Amino acid sequence: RGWFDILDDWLKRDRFVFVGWSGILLFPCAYLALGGWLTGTTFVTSWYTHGLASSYLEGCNFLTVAVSTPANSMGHSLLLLWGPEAQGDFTRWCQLGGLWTFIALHGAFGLIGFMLRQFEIARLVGVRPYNAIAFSAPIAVFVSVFLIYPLGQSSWFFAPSFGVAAIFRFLLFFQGFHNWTLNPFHMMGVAGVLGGALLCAIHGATVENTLFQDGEGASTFRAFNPTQAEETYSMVTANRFWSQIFGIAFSNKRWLHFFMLFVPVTGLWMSAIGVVGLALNLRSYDFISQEIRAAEDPEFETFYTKNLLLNEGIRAWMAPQDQPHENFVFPEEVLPRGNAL
Amino acid sequence: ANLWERFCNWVTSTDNRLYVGWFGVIMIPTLLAATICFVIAFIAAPPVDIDGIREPVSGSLLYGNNIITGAVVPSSNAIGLHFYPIWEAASLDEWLYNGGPYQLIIFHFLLGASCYMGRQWELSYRLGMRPWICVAYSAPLASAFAVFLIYPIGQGSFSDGMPLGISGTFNFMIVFQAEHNILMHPFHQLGVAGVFGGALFCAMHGSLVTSSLIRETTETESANYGYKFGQEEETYNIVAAHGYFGRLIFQYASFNNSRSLHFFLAAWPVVGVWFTALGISTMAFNLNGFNFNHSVIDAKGNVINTWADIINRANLGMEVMHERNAHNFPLDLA
Amino acid sequence: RSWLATSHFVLAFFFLVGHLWHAGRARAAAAGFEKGIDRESEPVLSMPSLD
Amino acid sequence: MEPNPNRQPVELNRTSLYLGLLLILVLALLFSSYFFN
Amino acid sequence: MEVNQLGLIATALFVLVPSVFLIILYVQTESQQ
């Protein structure tokens, strides 16, 4: 046999952890992304890029550690270790935020590798590729949020920093500056995620409560055999129940499970489209008719205008520390504030 | 049979297109009342003085709102937790000004939704099923109770209940973050795990079953016609699905037992949502998310900011701007 | 007051979940179908169709 | 003119009609506010 | 309220064009042998 065929044999051996040709891309990249996150969160600072402490070594906890984005002055530089910024100096690279681009790039290629793994394994075992197809939603979210959005903004600095509290700050920044909650694409994403959770719960519970009695045990799990040919629960009884409770019910199992694929995947894709818009500040920020009315009529008020006031507060109070490169100095007298607070 | 016997047989009949049951006898009138009042109010109600400072907020379509901005506005802070039925007002004009529709709607809705859960149990009993679908439903219902009743009880006013509208919901969320730092609360983090994971596992399960469908149709026909309602045999190959997923991660990370699988699907999101409901219901009593403001200090004593401090700046913006005319004293104690 | 109120709301709610769980199961076990549906006497199969 | 053998009948069942109408009407309800602006 | 004038026709067509597409397909399915 040729060396290519021998290598294919070895890569596709049946072992505890499947490797595959996709493994050559997936495993080094996924390992480097995860290891970079752990290394940065344990030992690396954000002092020179954000003015922040961001590691266990500095005293942060699991909620506050992060691998923070590079400084805004770096633009969209790849920040390669051998690049002109760090110039091969590992310590300076870490201090300049090279770990953020390191993680983002090795992670993107790791996602590519994992999807290729889905395809490869499906082909080898003879199943259809719908798991790989569904994984396109996480990939679309990751690309839109961590690459396209910063690429449309001034620099990597405004991408999410890899951390719990940093992600929370990302949420609040999007509310304050983009009015992201008002965006119908985020709304469709929310519908997809919450509806997916609803479907997950309702289907699990319906199956578990329409099981057939296939054993004498009061714990019903042992009464299923993976090689059995018969359905383990009564579709007829479940359909009757939901028809009489909610008015409509599934009657086709194949449609049911495809719908479970369709809902969350579509929702995430819609959210990604919205974020592509926000990359250009192309927001659903205002309703022009309401703004005209409110400008002319000081007694007109809605929850929309109230939320706009909240956004103005967020921007004014968070910008000076969240965007240190701007050198904002907002005198106390200019800060928006309500009475007494 | 006597008249009462006949009526009981009809009420509990499993042959009605929609089951009624004894829980339904309460559910139907209350949900109808809540629905009718909500629709009428959303379309036509006049502005409501939510914060009790004689600054009415417009919620209805006819008074300048669209679908996204409209809402049934919570009852006035002047009312607090007082019961404000129509007959407690001097007139419908006063009732509307003070936001009575909100109380009518949410009370009838909460009662009707509780009865909806009970009705799920009751019909399962009539049909000879196992009983715990209602337990699954208790998670979203608990969330509704948390935002419509528990949080108002803890804070002392139905004016702090969630508004019945889209932008109103956003307002509720933002103020909640300003006053309780919900993002840094472990129960909301468990809720996010619950819903992200629920969506994830929904997609995973749907995709695995769809990938293991057994060939029963041609390429010109939808594969869904390969399943006939009520057929005895399973329509997909769970053994193949397990082979795939076990090789995707590793053998022992994949379910080979469909019953265990579906129990996990039920349990993950349901428990997550229970915990998030408890998060709202406990922040109702002002036990707030983690506060690490100025936790990191240097040798001299300089504050070294963290992402938590950045969050705090955003929260301060929200806090100082919300309900801009309602506070007279320095602390917002409820 | 905050500690006590939060703790006991959590406990009260989970005990409501317990009531529902054990009451439903008690009804099902007394009636004889807490282990599942009998295949040869599935109640719904003997009922008229809704439509 | 010999007929084309590649023709196939097309179908949309009633449940699909209901699902599609629901999708369309809900999308309209969602986006109408932004169309009116 | 000073709304976008074209919003009315935008919404009407957004609803009607896909809905009529679906109705055509459904009725011609029902009429098949």
Binding site: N239, G247 | - | - | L25 | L8
Partner: peptide
Amino acid sequence: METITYVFIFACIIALFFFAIFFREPPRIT
């Protein structure tokens, strides 16, 4: 016009509910 549009769409959705529940294609066992 905008209020009419919103309410019209809502009423159409409710009618759709009615037909989808009471005029569904009936499930039929094989």
